[PDB]
Design a protein around this ligand. Structure first.
Ligand code: U
Length: 125
């Protein structure tokens, strides 16, 4: 199981965060009640060439509230690597009817944000 969407990549040194009311990827199969979730940070490192580990740019993946690797965390719960996003008017209920993605059945939806959304500096898709 995986995120329904492709990642955001962090080039700066701050964690992801969105203005209140923006941040949820567009998904034409979801309703206005579903527009709420969290982004989870994913780290990666490689043997850097000098024999030492090299940290790569963190990526951040979105999961609907109540799904994914932190399916049990309630909205706004404070956990390192977890940041919360919601469209105004989204219901605060688990989205188990959307679930997570099986890569052996569906590729990721290309991540895109609703118009007028400001990504923090150093974050790109
Ligand atoms: O936190 C993560 C890491 C990978 N993925 C995606 O899951 C898929 C499989 O990743 P994996 O081979 O590293 O398990 C691939 O499409 C990744 O981009 C997530 O959805 N969330």
């Amino acid at each position: 199981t995986a995120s329904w969407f492709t990642a955001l990549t962090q080039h700066g040194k701050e964690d992801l965060k969105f203005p209140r009311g923006q941040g949820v990827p567009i998904n034409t199969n979801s309703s206005p009640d579903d527009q709420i979730g969290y982004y989870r940070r994913a780290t990666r490192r490689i043997r850097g060439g000098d024999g030492k580990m090299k940290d790569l740019s963190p990526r951040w993946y979105f999961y609907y509230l109540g799904t994914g690797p932190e399916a049990g965390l309630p909205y706004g719960a404070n956990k390192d690597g977890i940041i919360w996003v919601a469209t105004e008017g989204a219901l605060n209920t688990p989205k188990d009817h959307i679930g997570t993605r099986n890569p052996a059945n569906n590729a990721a939806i290309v991540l895109q944000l609703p118009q007028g959304t400001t990504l923090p500096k150093g974050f790109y898709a």
